[PDB]
Amino acid sequence: ADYQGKNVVIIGLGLTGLSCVDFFLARGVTPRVMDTRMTPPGLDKLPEAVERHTGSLNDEWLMAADLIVASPGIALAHPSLSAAADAGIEIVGDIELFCREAQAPIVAITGSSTVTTLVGEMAKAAGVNVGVGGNIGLPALMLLDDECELYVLELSSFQLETTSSLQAVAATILNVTELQQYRAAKLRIYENAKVCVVNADDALTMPIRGADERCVSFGVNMGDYHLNHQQGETWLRVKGEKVLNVKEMKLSGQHNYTNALAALALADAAGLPRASSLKALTTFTGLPHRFEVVLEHNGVRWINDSKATNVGSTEAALNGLHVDGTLHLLLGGDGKSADFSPLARYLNGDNVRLYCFGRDGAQLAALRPEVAEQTETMEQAMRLLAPRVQPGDMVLLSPACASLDQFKNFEQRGNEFARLAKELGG
């Protein structure tokens, strides 16, 4: 849309509020920001030209606004917002701002992560540049920067409440778990959807009406997409046909089989090739910290392999690793008396750069010091490479060491890497 010369107020900062600020600053609009918290997150990232008010809502700013952009964290029933609404002031959310500008198909998912991640993996297996965001990953507005061909948004009922311009190529309510108002907000995801993917085992996921010929179902024993145990084997079944033995999947358990069925039905409805999507089901592990993609933005892939607390596990990550551009590898920690020389056969070539840290970091940078860097902690290493990273590059944390020298456990090192990937790469 055109927001030129409008008084815009953003309620709620954080990364989402920051994305709205950038969204408007890039369209010639300087917004005003307010947040009930005295020191909200992202306050230090907030530009200087932007007026901000913290510790409470500025009711005058709201009543004076032409457009109120409300984070899902503030209740729309709040008296100031209720008064703004009664005064005829337009209230929207960040997702509404996204859907007005999005030029690529949108897949929309709501219902009490894996489904959203799988759909993204299926699009990637088909060579589709996909932006995964919303209630997970990056905020939706930050996906407009890249050159996406498909959007996959995980949405809350709160985000849906303030969204009116969503026309998803495929939408789903996975579950409605603790009421009729809660369901009503979630059903908004179906409005103007080309295909509605519903849960055969949860009737509240079905539209009340107006979806007679655009519904596709997933379920355990029933639905267009369901499971079937026949000749002693369990099969994924799609539109009456066996398409995959669940033993080819890395994921396991009934819940992950229904997750795969739901993700498959969205990807099929969005036009992704079945063959490439089924392949994604055979490669996706969903293991935290084990070659876990934590951020895909601006053509860069940030991969958290903090689970590699030994030389053998890092060698596995490097072995057969195709990186279109530059691999930015981080190495360090407590090596635990390990010999890292076997890693050298994978660290030759032009596209390798090393960023070493931790207790045994000095010993790890000694694999090819000419193209290597050294630091004390993981954070300052990532701030060195973040300016240097360009599209096609991979930022891989396969440290080959345990994290007990500077971390509670390898999980903390992997979570900290994901936190800094969002800041540095977004």
Side-chain angles (χ1 to χ4, degrees), residues 1-47 49-177 180-228 230 232-321 323-389 391-426:
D2 175 54
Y3 304 99
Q4 197 287 309
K6 266 153 65 177
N7 183 253
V8 176
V9 176
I10 299 166
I11 301 159
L13 198 61
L15 192 60
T16 305
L18 288 168
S19 72
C20 299
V21 178
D22 273 4
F23 176 86
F24 289 108
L25 286 181
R27 285 167 184 72
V29 175
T30 297
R32 298 209 277 203
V33 193
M34 63 186 64
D35 195 308
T36 59
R37 294 164 294 195
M38 309 199 335
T39 298
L43 183 58
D44 60 333
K45 312 193 204 103
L46 193 62
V50 172
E51 265 184 301
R52 81 294 309 282
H53 175 90
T54 60
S56 63
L57 298 176
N58 187 324
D59 195 76
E60 170 47 28
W61 286 11
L62 298 168
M63 306 308 305
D66 297 310
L67 176 55
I68 293 173
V69 181
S71 160
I74 182 179
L76 294 148
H78 190 284
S80 291
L81 267 180
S82 170
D86 293 332
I89 304 182
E90 190 182 8
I91 300 166
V92 307
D94 70 316
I95 300 306
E96 174 59 15
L97 298 180
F98 175 88
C99 291
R100 291 165 170 193
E101 324 299 333
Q103 285 264 108
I106 298 180
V107 177
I109 295 158
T110 191
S112 178
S113 62
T114 300
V115 169
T116 300
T117 301
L118 272 174
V119 175
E121 290 295 325
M122 296 173 181
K124 291 183 248 201
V128 177
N129 183 315
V130 56
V132 186
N135 215 45
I136 74 190
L138 286 178
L141 286 175
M142 294 182 84
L143 309 179
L144 292 179
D145 295 324
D146 306 359
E147 34 187 25
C148 293
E149 301 169 289
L150 176 68
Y151 299 110
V152 186
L153 303 184
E154 183 159 309
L155 303 173
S156 67
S157 63
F158 310 104
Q159 286 173 303
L160 289 162
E161 281 176 346
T162 58
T163 306
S164 59
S165 298
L166 172 60
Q167 320 186 45
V169 69
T172 183
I173 299 175
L174 299 170
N175 286 280
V176 193
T177 299
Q180 180 252 80
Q181 297 177 339
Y182 174 65
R183 186 193 176 188
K186 292 232 184 290
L187 282 163
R188 301 177 59 82
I189 200 171
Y190 291 145
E191 200 69 285
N192 306 311
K194 162 163 142 66
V195 177
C196 305
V197 173
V198 310
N199 186 348
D201 301 313
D202 187 338
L204 301 196
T205 68
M206 245 117 295
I208 304 185
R209 64 171 52 80
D212 306 292
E213 84 306 345
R214 55 191 179 105
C215 275
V216 165
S217 60
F218 71 88
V220 179
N221 308 291
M222 223 65 80
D224 300 299
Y225 299 64
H226 67 257
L227 302 175
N228 185 208
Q230 298 239 289
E233 309 282 344
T234 292
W235 304 88
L236 303 186
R237 303 208 57 151
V238 180
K239 310 198 181 182
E241 155 182 60
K242 294 203 258 281
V243 304
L244 191 69
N245 188 317
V246 300
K247 287 162 182 192
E248 303 181 48
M249 289 176 58
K250 305 281 145 288
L251 292 180
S252 188
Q254 184 205 92
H255 289 7
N256 277 330
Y257 298 149
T258 41
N259 287 331
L261 291 173
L264 202 68
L266 297 154
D268 285 341
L272 293 171
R274 176 86 54 72
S276 47
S277 300
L278 287 171
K279 188 181 197 171
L281 291 179
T282 76
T283 71
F284 184 79
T285 66
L287 298 163
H289 312 278
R290 189 47 169 157
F291 218 85
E292 173 182 40
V293 178
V294 300
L295 176 58
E296 277 196 345
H297 197 242
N298 294 333
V300 190
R301 302 177 284 157
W302 304 70
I303 299 204
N304 162 27
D305 193 20
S306 172
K307 190 106 180 197
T309 57
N310 47 66
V311 52
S313 295
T314 287
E315 170 169 37
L318 301 178
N319 202 311
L321 185 71
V323 176
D324 208 12
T326 297
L327 173 68
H328 301 269
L329 175 55
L330 298 122
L331 300 156
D334 178 63
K336 297 183 163 159
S337 302
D339 176 13
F340 307 105
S341 52
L343 304 179
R345 68 181 298 245
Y346 313 94
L347 299 167
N348 281 89
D350 304 10
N351 322 86
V352 199
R353 227 73 66 207
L354 293 304
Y355 306 83
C356 308
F357 63 95
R359 184 191 293 182
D360 294 6
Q363 186 187 352
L364 261 162
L367 278 154
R368 186 181 176 187
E370 54 266 32
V371 303
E373 319 287 327
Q374 213 200 327
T375 62
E376 153 164 13
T377 193
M378 183 185 70
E379 166 156 353
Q380 57 189 133
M382 289 161 76
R383 300 183 172 282
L384 174 64
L385 55 86
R388 306 164 122 179
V389 153
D393 299 2
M394 170 180 294
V395 185
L396 171 55
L397 179 77
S398 197
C401 304
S403 76
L404 294 178
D405 56 324
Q406 309 169 331
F407 301 85
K408 292 184 181 178
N409 48 11
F410 73 83
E411 280 87 356
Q412 197 194 38
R413 183 177 58 189
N415 292 318
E416 178 73 341
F417 168 86
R419 182 189 72 76
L420 286 146
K422 282 246 278 185
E423 156 161 20
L424 300 160

